[PDB]
């Protein structure tokens, strides 16, 4: 029905919906990635934060998903429809689970709030005009 | 790899699972009573407890699945094994869910702890055969009163 | 030779001998169970109470049983006894297990003392008549 | 699955190993041993340390692994292999015992503590040079040893 | 067997995996410029700093060791064999010892904590799609 | 260039050198021992004291150095030269890790000072030849007790 994972997070999918897919790097990149930077704390009684409660659902729910994707071509024979599923997934469902998931990470990684400005901000460099707009687009940043 | 999301819940899916299938409520009816239930905090940005939220992600997750599941028919014209997908999901899939999803449910409803202890001693029921243990399993009490 | 597992806690094997195996779950199930729970306080660096360690070694015995029985007709071509090994697993010894094994267990949820009282009051339970037997046996339920 | 029997008392196989297989002395001598210096206790329901239970325990153990071994021939008397295996057990699964088995017993006499101590600094003994060392190592009694 | 030099200083190899070894410059310049910076501190009865101590290891093990590795190319003769080691050495081998050299340095250059940061910052430049990620990747900085 | 990895450990290598290789145990014998003893605050990330750490790069080291070991006859294959440098190696080069490594190992046992004072008067021993020095030498003396 309606419900929005970011709201929670004070935040909104059409924000990120003007950004395109596109950018979000490879889940696997973001996997491997965030995974072994907090594997601990990943695997810990304690949900510290929401992200990391939240994190596992698209985990399991994809690694579960994923699982059951390669099954697809084992109980089943017809390559027909069997290599045609594989795209749809490891692609326009990446999607809402690769930003997201990254989205997630920043956090921990830099930090809610914080975070908010890297959103809008590159959308005003996106929708400027390619002639001004410096290639030079804005970047998870420093400290203080 | 390997994670549980339940290590913070403090309980374990391995654990559950016994859980004979003939436990867990329709999907739908686990989806109805869930929302119908707590509604409006429900789709509001105030996260009371972690549980609300990934629950929400299983949400999503299951929404596409099903956005996903209609998706299969649609597009798709072979079937033979159509049929042979929305079963295992519908199954073999909302299983996970139901089963979690429900006990999240449960968790709000009746309190973390005093949840478990009801799975916990349950546990014991199956893992015990026929004609002894009472058909009369325990079941979700509403919270004892006083003391 | 002559010494009573149960008898660090008051108790013989005759007791629950009162409860001739066929009820005692089978040792897998009742495994799990442990772990299930006390996965980390398990394998946790304190003696909380002897019990664990108890546990744990029926744990070690079995776990090189298991791995000695398997090994049992595998890494040694053998005849009408390559699944009559199996048998004696099972019956006469396993038995003593998943009982003390489960034994133990219960009481770390429900009380050592209680515990026993179970087996006892139901012990008459069981040994009184079915027609007139109560229509419930009594169970480790959280108490109520 | 995994564990250590040891860490219920802050120890570790490996150290074992570390130790000459032969270094323990066979079960008999270690079985009666105890039997016959504290036999009065073990029997009594008291788990004054909790070493007692483990201990016994490996009896049960052992004491249907030999209520066995002599049943690994009993009602079949196989050609090749009926004492092939009596072998192999003691030697690859006594060994784990008799280590621990002893490690336990002299344990209980020689305190906790004095007990690892001993071996810890006796192992390099061993893991170091001849003319580089005493005629032997050290030994085990009470008051000698340090903290 | 299992030990990462980098934990102690809270830190992990794949963080550094996933950042190619073609990146941390060749030893020499490494080594050279380190050296001739604190050398006085290096050969100093004082290892104030973990690094500094570990630093030599490196050293001492691939110093001592090319010192070796020139060896080879004395009291052998083989020219197929001894021309083909180098290879491996130089390369295969500089990798653990270039990044990890350089790790070592960045601190006491700039400082532990801080370090972290070009890290995982990297890590999000990297990781990042080609035609957004400006090639003005992240660099060690300044001071506040 | 020229340096001392005991510079900041208040001696140096030039003298314990003098220490004839039949004098340090089998690198493994080394390995296990070490390991065996403090193995868990060994993986641990706290640096308690430096002597640790760079143990650990000695590892790493050795290990990639044997990593490597094993590589030599993999990929060579020159029976001649192959078995030329596994000697050089775990010979003329286990010596300065041998060497210093157990030293290490000493150190935490034993507590770096008096550790090298030990070393120290050993010094005199082999500069001292036959007939008189006793066959005693001093030994690694588990630090005697009190005052």
Redesign the interface.
């Known amino acids: 029905?309606?419900?929005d994972?970011y709201?929670?997070?004070?935040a909104t999918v059409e924000l990120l919906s003007f950004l395109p897919s596109?950018?979000f790097?490879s889940v696997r990149?973001?996997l491997?990635?965030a995974?072994?930077?907090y594997?601990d704390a990943?695997?810990?009684?304690?949900?510290a934060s929401?992200h990391?409660?939240?994190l596992?659902?698209?985990?399991?729910?994809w690694g579960?998903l994923m699982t059951?994707a390669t099954?697809?071509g084992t109980n089943?024979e017809?390559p027909?429809?069997?290599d045609?599923?594989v795209s749809?997934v490891n692609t326009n469902?990446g999607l809402?689970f690769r930003q997201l998931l990254w989205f997630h990470i920043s956090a921990l990684?830099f930090g809610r709030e914080t975070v908010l400005e890297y959103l809008v901000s590159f959308g005003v460099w996106i929708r400027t005009p390619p002639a001004y707009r410096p290639?030079?687009?804005p970047?998870?940043?420093?400290?203080?």
């Open positions: 029905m309606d419900i994972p709201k929670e997070f004070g596109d950018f790097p990149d973001l491997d990635t995974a072994a930077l594997r990943l695997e810990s009684p304690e949900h929401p990391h409660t939240a596992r659902q698209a985990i399991l729910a579960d059951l099954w697809v089943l017809d027909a429809s069997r045609l599923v749809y469902v809402k990684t290639p030079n687009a970047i998870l940043s420093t400290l203080p």
